């Protein structure tokens, strides 16, 4: 199981509108991160024949694990929800085993935006390595699933609804999955939360929790 870290500098912020008044999300979903990763290889094509229906040029990277977190302060504003965090930093962690280190690093250096067109984002540095799996009590900053238990004080937890990869095909709605975010609503920032969990990869001290 290999892992990679990437540091992104944002220009003005990101904007992803909730499916189904147009409120937005607080942090990008894993689908957006996987698509941003896949952009490095599938650049220039917008419709590929999956075999039965044209749904997206991204239904092939669906088995890559990804998380992300903030490192600065920003504000969520509706005026079409947006998250303004100019000149901020975003740290993204990719954990997978499908491709070798070289391919993942090459695709990691090839990220241009997160969400819509305006949300450009530069790349400052990357790291590649091998991760280890543990199950003891850990402290994390990246968001995780709803089913994961919690030992600390419930003070900085929020609930959001994300979708699986099934939504990659047009004319179809993805399955709803609950997620827990360790975020302060105003102003936006990230806080550490201690969890027990069952699977957690050590990617440099900042343990990442998946289940």
């Amino acid at each position: 199981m290999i892992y990679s870290k990437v540091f992104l500098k944002l220009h003005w912020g990101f904007s992803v509108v909730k499916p189904l008044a147009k409120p937005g999300f607080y942090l990008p979903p894993p689908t957006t991160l996987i698509g941003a990763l896949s952009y490095g290889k599938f650049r220039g094509v917008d419709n590929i024949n999956l075999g039965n229906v044209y749904g997206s040029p991204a239904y092939n990277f669906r088995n890559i694990m990804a998380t992300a977190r903030l490192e600065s302060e920003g504000v969520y504003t509706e005026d079409t929800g947006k998250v303004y965090i100019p000149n901020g930093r975003l740290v993204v962690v990719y954990v997978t085993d499908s491709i070798s280190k070289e391919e993942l690093e090459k695709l990691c250096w090839s990220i241009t935006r997160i969400g819509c067109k305006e949300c450009l984002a530069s790349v400052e540095n990357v790291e590649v390595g091998e991760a280890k799996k543990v199950s003891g009590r850990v402290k994390t900053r990246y968001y995780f699933r709803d089913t994961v238990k919690v030992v600390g004080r419930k003070e900085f937890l929020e609930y959001v609804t994300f979708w699986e990869e099934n939504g990659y095909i047009w004319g179809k709605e993805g399955s709803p999955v609950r997620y827990i975010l360790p975020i302060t609503t105003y102003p936006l920032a990230s806080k550490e939360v201690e969890v027990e969990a069952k699977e957690a990869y050590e990617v440099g001290g900042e343990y990442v929790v998946f289940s």
């Binding site: 419709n47 504000v75 984002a121």
Partner: protein, 317 residues
């Protein structure tokens, strides 16, 4: 590709208004958080959206294209960028709707050949068999630089009156003056290339012939944005712009420069360009810089003086 970061200085300005309240027209603002020794402060700062710039760029491209004889759509000849979105739009231009998924590529080629803006700008057709085309030009919001511990932007309300001989006549307008910065991306390599898998359909040879002219026109259209012909209320509130710092990078692989929010953002982008070329096995990497506020540049960069030189050098390569 072509990537750019640009820094602007604007005075006594109102280009992007928003919903009117009472008898007042308001400017567009966004909240930012500023760090102080005591703590944090929330400040509202004027901005300019990313849609006005796209509209100005598309209008300039239309004006340039109609001079060289390239095809232009009927509804896009008028400055009405609805594009071939619904059936009513297709009826005026005279294009049959796509039959099924397998015939999508033919429809895309037909649209791409009947209108340049639908190619460079991109279009979306809703219906039973939707067709997509992402824009070849990416533009972001114009936000003043959050540099240091002070935000160099203000916003005031001005009072105006219309004179009449039989009183029975008052309005207010918000004006601003900031130090703006924005960055953009363009991919001239994907111009005049269809964006759907399948087999080649008759008519692609015309696109191959027109590729060079379309690329030249798309590059030429950047002069309008880099010269400052965007926004509104220019009849009575014509602004006063000026160029301070500009970095443009031309490569053969994905890359973008640092945001122009720090006082030293050219050295960082040059170093990162070197590293990215080293890691991604690129071949072409050139940087052009225009400097007017006297900040540190670095080494290994051609120094220009104006924007026309930049456009000439971009076209040559």
């Amino acid at each position: 590709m072509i990537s750019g970061s640009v820094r602007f200085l604007v005075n006594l300005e109102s280009l992007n208004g928003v919903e009117s309240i009472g008898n007042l027209t308001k400017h567009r603002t966004a909240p930012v958080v500023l760090k102080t020794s005591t703590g944090y402060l929330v400040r509202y700062v004027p901005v300019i959206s990313g849609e006005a710039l796209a509209h100005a760029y598309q209008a300039s491209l239309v004006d340039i294209a109609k001079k060289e004889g390239l095809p232009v759509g009927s509804l896009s000849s008028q400055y009405e960028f609805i594009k071939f979105s619904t059936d009513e739009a297709l009826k005026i231009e005279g294009i049959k709707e796509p039959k099924d998924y397998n015939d999508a590529r033919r429809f895309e080629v037909e649209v791409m050949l009947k209108d340049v803006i639908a190619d460079v700008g991109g279009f979306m057709y809703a219906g039973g068999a939707p067709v997509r085309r992402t824009s070849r030009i990416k533009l972001g919001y114009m936000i003043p630089a959050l540099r240091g511990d002070e935000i160099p932007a203000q916003l005031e309300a001005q009072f105006h009156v219309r004179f009449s001989n039989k009183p029975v006549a008052i309005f207010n307008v918000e004006v601003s003056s900031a130090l703006y910065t924005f960055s953009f991306e363009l991919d001239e390599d994907l111009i005049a290339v269809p964006s759907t898998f399948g087999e080649k359909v008759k008519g692609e040879e015309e696109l191959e012939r027109q590729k060079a002219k379309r690329v030249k026109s798309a590059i030429k259209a950047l002069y309008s944005l880099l010269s400052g012909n965007f926004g509104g209320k220019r009849s009575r509130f014509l602004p006063s712009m000026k160029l301070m710092s500009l970095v443009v990078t031309k490569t053969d692989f994905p890359f973008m420069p640092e945001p122009a929010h720090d006082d030293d953002y050219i050295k960082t982008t040059i170093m990162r360009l070197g590293k990215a070329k080293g890691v991604l096995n690129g071949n072409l990497a050139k940087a052009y810089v225009i400097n007017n506020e006297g900040i540190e540049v670095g080494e290994g960069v051609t120094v220009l003086s104006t924007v026309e030189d930049l456009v000439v050098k971009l076209e040559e390569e």
